Ligand binder design. Structure first.
Ligand SMILES: CCCCCCCCCCCCCCCCCC(=O)OC[C@H](COP(=O)([O-])OCC[N+](C)(C)C)OC(=O)CCCCCCCCCCCCCCCCC
Ligand SMILES: CCCCCCCCCCCCCCCCCC(=O)OC[C@H](COP(=O)([O-])OCC[N+](C)(C)C)OC(=O)CCCCCCCCCCCCCCCCC
Ligand code: SF4
Ligand code: SF4
Ligand code: SF4
Lengths: 97, 150, 80, 376, 318, 115, 171, 70
């Protein structure tokens, strides 16, 4: 029964984000609850993840930090907080992180 | 009055209703932004054709000398509060047709512009960034605190 | 009459269907076997009170009790 | 007005609600391109042609490049010709997607717009990969093209062309057999062949009326005579036949794209005459002649022999022509742009006589009109 | 304690209207291969609250040329009329037990067009006049069919009461002996509520906004909630008319669950319908309802007149 | 009585929303926001010019068909009558009169549009 | 070479049944419900970005040599090839006698983003860089001087150099 | 994915459940545990007024049985 596998995937997405707290944090911040392979992190706190099973355009993403250059970025996340090397990687310009 | 200011700033910035005012290439770029790839409707941004039920206006294209009274009347018929988002280079400073005899050198001369989006045409991701910047500008409004101080 | 019927069925089937239903509703109740059953069903509904009558002593049909066999029964609707 | 294409002023004398006299007041997007062209050289006047018809960009680039190459008595390499034809067919698919989806939105079916604008975004990504800009490529230049195709692009083109015919079939199921879509276009905007030719109509309008004429089959350009494809011909002059012709033109564009992808030859991408096409940046920094030619090409511009020409290409809207007159200097003396939208909007008065107002907006939709092209 | 019952009837249908706007945008995006509103809240649960507060802190912007009496009178009358016909609906026990609730529904549905006419005429514009004329033509089209549909469906019920309509479902649904009339009734409910492809008043491509093109925020939201309460209530009425459920006097939970699920599915079907078809011209509206619908429903009306006499199946009036 | 209470409560809730929508926010009006809407240009004349409306006969015959409905509407209670033959014959007769009016409209070119 | 588009009791009964029972309307509704049950293509902006290319035409930048010394040599080819006349250059020799610039102004509300200056520069000084999210709030902020262009170059050198390394063999 | 609409529409289900159920529960309060006596004609009203006049508390829902008489 494939629906039980869907429920298993849902509970593993709940567990794999650090728990209910991380699940609710990523739900209220990124409006998404998908887990992925952690590509890396930068010096500010931006955690860059990937998951090759998703379709093109959704295979690479970033969770932004909470305090970059003095401002509180818990809710005011901006598109221009990406350093240039991660800017090159994130927009699908090359396959080398 | 600080928290009530925080409430009405959240209500206005999460239900922005733009108006269908395009003129040129940049209008097709706006329609490309409204495609399922970028999905303006997920941000509380749904197109409304009437100026009387619109919140913001994105001026896309070249504003010519035959078009300035029309844009001015359409802007003057919108209810307060109203924000104007310039788009492209034609509505920014004339752009390619800056020196032409029948092109208004930037639509700032007709309407007060809040957010400048540069490009020719600007990419739809950049346009989404400009709309998010406008939302963050609405968020930091201080109407009721300033009213309480006055 | 087959060619004309095929023509109107090809042009507008709605008029053909409407006229067929109208003709059926006209000619079928005149051939129905249960219309008189509807007549006695409507006539047998006890709306007002069944007041009795005075007695001169000469009546073979009307009863003195509701459970007496004399008088009309309603077995036909009970079975149907 | 959403049914209006941004800039339009249709003043109509509604006799109750039917039209007796309809007049399109235009000029709300008259930038005056043909005066700004004569103050710039040919390379500087090339990006002006990207913005006339902003759904048919590369076809206008091809028309301008064909005019300049006919005046310069030079021809591009065959690989450049095949690249130009392939991207012109992608441009034709772009324009037909936009026209059909906007017409269906203006009539009331708003789903195929969102269904195929992601395919339109995919082709915009193809433009992004091949030129560096999502919309205004400035890729087709006099002398061939500007840059070669990047590695791995043609596999993406083949995959998209393989999977696009299912979307075409989905749209054709969603609109062609729909009775509500049919009843808006059975006998609306009927035109005759004599009034098609006498009113200056070109392209689909002629093919809507049964006239057999296509510039890709009678007066061919670069490699279009080496590609086999079909030409749809209507039979009643209504909007239904024109929409069917546009869908069939999309299918034939897929066919031409397959033929292009199976027949691209190796070679260079510019005319090797360095006095017209700029030299490569590798040999510019090593050879003195290449540096001099790069300097004078990007500062003065190549000279064109004096004379006047009028070339015409099969644009996705019809026949796109330019009358270019050069006086021998590095700047054109007079560049006039002939567009199908001008004659189509002129014939809108005749085509809309005797119809209700919704049928007038349907007639407006059935002409693929871009008003930057119309106002020049 | 009728005040508490009235409040609990009238407030959650407004909440249902708001969440109908939510799921409207979500589903309407979802068949268009895109996501819906999900940024503001978790899966966009705070979108209706932002929409409601945003419309009520804008500027009302009364026009100078508009006659202020009917301009201020139209939206309140629209909202009241969309609210005042909810009462005869059995849910499983209606608020007011009227013997002639069908006639009340018909008359208050005839009254619902007057807000549209007064909003069209009160604002001095050509677009509002054209919208009022198209609304008049829509009423011409739909009334003379809808009355006969309701009468011919109701002919097996035996009386005009909506409470006795739940009794007739105890054996079989009336959608089985009246499936053509079910199709006629669904098209009529499509036409009455002014939803696509029978919108013809709040047109985007034909007009700008039609009858309320001059209506700015505040007064504009009343028409929105009136139309959405109208479509929700009309689907509930269709569910009660054709797909009535099993009623048990000892447990109303079963019938509330069943008719809620059925009406919700019918509203989802309405959302599915409203964005798959091109908009009809209003000259073809009475080239269809006065031409194709009317003779068919006349034939079916005389058939349903002559049918209980045929089969000896005269329903009781009590 | 309960119908009156429901009507008064509905009217109170309706008229309270517009009052909240009007007197709560800050008003700021000039002589352009109150102008009539004509897609950004001045209106040509006024909207009080007589429309050359084309379905006048359709509106009048809607009225007449509504009165046909008014004749045909008390039919369910007539299902409880005793004289069933006259009931059925004359309900069929009145529906046939409605159909005769519609057919005469169809033949004599009334359901179409003027001009 | 050419084709005829739209030139075409059981069949009549099938057409009447399609009229009364709405067969093709059910087919179109079925395709609508098919598109309901697919995966939507909405990418999670701003946490996700759309695909791009190393040739992307974005924000103007002034590069530098790998020794700290600036790349522009005041040759005025970019302002001569610019179709919008958005570039203003004023030049003079500085203290060491090197031909450099004193004023290098780009009017970004005039620029059409067509990349002629990035291909006409003989030393690859001016580059249409990769940044597209640079929307401003005031008109004067979209009017770059030489200091802002040099700051943009020093900001985005780490990816501009990689993009040039990836793309330079096609030129 | 698609099932994400299934939360929000469920809320509308509650918004279509709270009114009608409440009426039934109100009918289980003012009528003393029974349903509201549906009056449709004059005889039903006469019987309800008979209960009102015999109950002695001027409430029709207080139904007295055969134990009332001796
Ligand atoms: C209420 C429960 C749920 C209902 C279904 C809901 C889901 C399905 C919704 C589908 C989409 C609906 C909206 C889009 C369409 C809107 C336009 C529209 O409806 O137009 C009506 C269309 C319009 O037809 P048209 O558009 O084809 O018109 C062309 C007309 N001619 C051919 C003349 C050129 O159909 C009708 O008007 C017919 C009315 C309904 C017919 C029902 C027939 C029932 C069976 C009768 C008997 C058959 C047997 C033969 C006789 C036997 C006699 C004994
Ligand atoms: C679904 C339910 C919806 C309910 C309604 C919406 C919920 C929120 C209700 C309150 C919203 C805020 C007040 C109304 C809107 C005010 C907008 C605004 O910017 O006003 C600025 C104004 C101040 O600006 P001002 O007076 O200088 O005027 C601005 C316009 N000029 C300068 C051009 C003249 O605020 C007020 O006037 C104060 C209003 C009352 C504030 C609270 C007082 C104490 C209450 C206890
Ligand atoms: S800024 Fe560029 S893309 Fe936009 S309208 Fe002007 S020329 Fe077209
Ligand atoms: S990209 Fe083109 S328009 Fe912009 S500064 Fe460079 S040459 Fe001028
Ligand atoms: S083309 Fe390059 S070197 Fe020449 S002036 Fe411009 S930026 Fe400087």
């Amino acid at each position: 029964m494939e629906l039980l596998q869907v429920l298993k995937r849902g509970l593993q997405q709940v567990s794999g984000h650090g728990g209910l707290r991380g699940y609710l944090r990523v739900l209220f911040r990124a409006n998404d609850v998908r887990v992925g392979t952690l590509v890396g992190e930068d010096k500010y706190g931006n955690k860059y993840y990937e998951d090759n099973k998703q379709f093109f355009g959704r295979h690479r993403w970033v969770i932004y930090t909470t305090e970059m250059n003095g401002k509180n970025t818990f809710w005011d996340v901006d598109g221009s907080m990406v350093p240039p090397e991660w800017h090159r990687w994130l927009h699908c310009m090359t396959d080398d992180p | 009055v600080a928290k009530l200011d925080d409430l009405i700033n959240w209500a206005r910035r999460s239900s922005l209703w733009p108006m269908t005012f395009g003129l040129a290439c940049c209008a097709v770029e706006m329609m490309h932004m409204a495609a399922p790839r970028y999905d303006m409707d997920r941000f509380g941004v749904v197109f409304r054709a009437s100026p009387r039920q619109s919140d913001v206006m994105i001026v896309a294209g070249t504003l010519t000398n035959k078009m300035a009274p029309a844009l001015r009347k359409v802007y003057d018929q919108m209810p307060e509060p109203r924000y104007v988002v310039s788009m492209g280079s034609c509505a920014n400073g004339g752009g390619y047709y800056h020196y032409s005899y029948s092109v208004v050198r930037g639509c700032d001369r007709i309407v007060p512009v809040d957010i400048y989006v540069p490009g020719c045409p600007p990419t739809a991701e950049a346009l989404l960034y400009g709309i998010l910047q406008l939302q963050k500008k609405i968020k930091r409004e201080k109407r009721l605190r300033i009213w309480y101080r006055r | 009459v087959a060619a004309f019927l095929k023509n109107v069925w090809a042009k507008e089937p709605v008029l053909v269907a409407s006229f067929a239903i109208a003709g059926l509703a006209v000619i079928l109740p005149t051939l129905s076997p249960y219309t008189k059953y509807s007549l006695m069903i409507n006539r047998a509904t006890p709306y007002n009170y069944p007041v009795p009558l005075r007695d001169d002593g000469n009546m073979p049909d009307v009863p003195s009790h509701p459970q007496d066999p004399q008088g009309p029964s309603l077995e036909w609707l009970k079975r149907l | 007005h959403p049914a209006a294409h941004g800039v339009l002023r249709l003043v109509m004398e509604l006799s109750g609600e039917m039209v007796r006299k309809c007049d399109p007041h235009i000029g709300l997007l008259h930038r005056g391109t043909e005066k700004l062209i004569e103050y710039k050289t040919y390379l500087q006047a090339l990006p002006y042609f990207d913005r006339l018809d902003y759904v048919s960009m590369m076809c206008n680039e091809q028309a301008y490049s064909l005019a300049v190459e006919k005046l310069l008595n030079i021809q591009p390499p065959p690989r450049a010709q095949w690249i130009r034809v392939l991207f012109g067919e992608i441009t034709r698919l772009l324009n037909h997607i936009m026209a059909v989806t906007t017409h269906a939105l203006d009539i009331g079916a708003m789903t195929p717009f969102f269904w195929m604008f992601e395919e339109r975004e995919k082709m915009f990504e193809f433009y992004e990969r091949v030129s560096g800009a999502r919309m205004h490529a400035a890729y087709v230049r006099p002398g061939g093209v500007h840059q070669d195709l990047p590695l791995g692009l043609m596999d993406d083109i083949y995959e998209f062309s393989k999977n696009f015919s299912l979307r075409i079939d989905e749209l054709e199921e969603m609109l062609t057999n729909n009775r509500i879509w049919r009843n808006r276009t059975v006998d609306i905007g009927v035109v005759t062949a004599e009034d098609a030719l006498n009113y200056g109509f070109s392209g689909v309008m002629l093919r809507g009326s049964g006239i057999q004429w296509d510039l890709r089959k009678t007066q061919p350009y670069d490699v279009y005579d080496q590609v086999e494809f079909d030409v749809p011909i209507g039979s009643r002059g209504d909007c239904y036949d024109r929409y069917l012709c546009r869908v069939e033109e999309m299918r034939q564009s897929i066919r031409i794209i397959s033929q292009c992808l199976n027949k691209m030859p190796p070679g260079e991408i510019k005319v090797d005459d360095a006095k017209v096409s700029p030299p490569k940046r590798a040999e510019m920094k090593t050879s003195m002649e290449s540096l001099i030619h790069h300097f004078k090409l990007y500062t003065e511009g190549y000279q064109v022999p004096p004379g006047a020409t009028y070339t015409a290409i099969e644009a996705p809207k019809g026949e796109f022509g330019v009358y270019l007159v050069s006086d021998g200097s590095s700047r054109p003396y007079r560049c006039k742009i002939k567009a199908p939208g001008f004659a189509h909007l002129a014939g809108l008065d005749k085509m809309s006589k005797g119809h209700m107002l919704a049928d007038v907006v349907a007639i407006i939709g059935t002409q693929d009109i871009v008003f930057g092209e119309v106002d020049r | 304690m009728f005040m508490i019952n009235v409040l609990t009837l009238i407030i959650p249908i407004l909440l249902a209207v708001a969440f109908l706007t939510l799921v409207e945008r979500k589903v309407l995006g979802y068949m268009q291969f895109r996501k819906g509103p999900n940024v503001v809240g978790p899966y966009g649960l705070l979108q209706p609250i932002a929409d409601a507060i945003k419309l009520f802190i804008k500027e009302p912007l009364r026009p100078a040329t508009s006659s202020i009496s009917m301009f201020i009178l139209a939206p309140i009358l629209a909202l009241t009329l969309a609210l005042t016909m909810w009462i005869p609906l059995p849910m499983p026990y209606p608020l007011i037990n009227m013997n002639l609730g069908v006639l009340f529904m018909l008359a208050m549905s005839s009254l619902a067009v007057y807000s549209i006419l007064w909003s069209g005429w009160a604002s001095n514009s050509k677009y509002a006049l054209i919208g009022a004329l198209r609304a008049v033509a829509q009423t011409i089209s739909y009334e003379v069919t809808l009355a006969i549909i309701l009468l011919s469906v109701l002919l097996m019920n035996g009386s005009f009461t909506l409470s006795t309509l739940i009794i007739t479902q105890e054996q079989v649904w009336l959608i089985f002996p009246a499936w053509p009339l079910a199709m006629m009734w669904f098209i009529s409910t499509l036409a009455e509520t002014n939803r696509a492809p029978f919108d013809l008043t709040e047109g985007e491509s034909e007009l700008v906004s039609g009858f309320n093109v001059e209506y700015a925020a505040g007064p504009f939201a009343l028409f929105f909630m009136a139309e959405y309460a109208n479509i929700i209530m009309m689907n509930i009425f269709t569910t009660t008319l054709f797909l009535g459920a099993f009623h048990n006097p000892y447990m109303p939970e079963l019938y509330t669950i069943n008719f809620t699920i059925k009406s919700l599915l019918l509203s989802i079907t309405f959302l599915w319908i409203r964005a798959s078809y091109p908009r009809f011209r209003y000259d073809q509206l009475m080239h269809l309802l006065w031409k194709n619908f009317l003779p068919l429903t006349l034939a079916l009306c005389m058939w349903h007149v002559s049918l209980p006499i045929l089969l000896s199946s005269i329903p009781p009036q009590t | 009585m309960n119908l009156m209470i429901t009507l008064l409560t509905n009217f109170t809730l309706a008229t309270l929303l517009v009052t909240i929508a009007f007197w709560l926010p800050q008003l700021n009006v000039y002589s352009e926001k109150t102008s009539p809407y004509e897609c950004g240009f001045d209106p040509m004349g006024s909207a009080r010019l007589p429309f050359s409306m084309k379905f006048f006969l359709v509106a009048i015959t809607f009225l007449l068909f509504d009165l046909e409905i008014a004749l045909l509407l008390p039919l369910p209670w007539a299902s409880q009558t005793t004289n069933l033959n006259t009931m059925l014959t004359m309900a069929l007769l009145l529906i046939f009169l409605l159909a005769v009016s519609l057919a005469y409209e169809w033949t004599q070119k009334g359901l179409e549009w003027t001009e | 070479t050419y084709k005829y588009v739209n030139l075409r009791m059981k069949s009549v009964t099938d057409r009447a049944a399609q009229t009364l029972l709405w067969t093709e309307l059910i087919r179109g509704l079925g395709m609508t419900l098919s598109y309901l049950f697919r995966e939507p293509a909405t990418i999670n902006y701003p946490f996700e970005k759309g695909p791009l290319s190393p040739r992307f035409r974005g924000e103007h930048a002034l590069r530098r040599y790998p020794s700290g010394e600036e790349r522009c040599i005041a040759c005025k080819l970019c302002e001569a090839v610019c179709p919008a006349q958005a570039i203003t250059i004023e030049a003079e020799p500085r203290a060491d006698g090197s031909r450099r610039t004193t004023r290098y102004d780009i009017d970004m509300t005039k620029c059409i983003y067509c990349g002629f200056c990035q291909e006409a520069c003989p030393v690859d000084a001016i580059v249409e860089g990769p940044n597209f999210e640079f929307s401003t709030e005031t008109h004067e902020e979209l009017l770059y001087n030489k200091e802002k262009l040099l700051n943009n170059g020093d900001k985005w050198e780490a990816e501009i150099a990689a993009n040039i390394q990836a793309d330079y063999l096609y030129r | 994915m698609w099932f994400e609409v299934l939360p929000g529409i469920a809320v509308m289900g509650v918004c279509l459940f709270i009114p009608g159920m409440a009426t039934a529960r109100i009918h289980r309060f003012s009528n003393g545990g029974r349903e509201k006596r549906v009056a449709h004609y004059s005889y039903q009203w006469y019987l309800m007024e008979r209960d009102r006049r015999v109950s002695g508390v001027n409430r029709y829902y207080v139904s007295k049985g055969l134990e009332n008489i001796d």
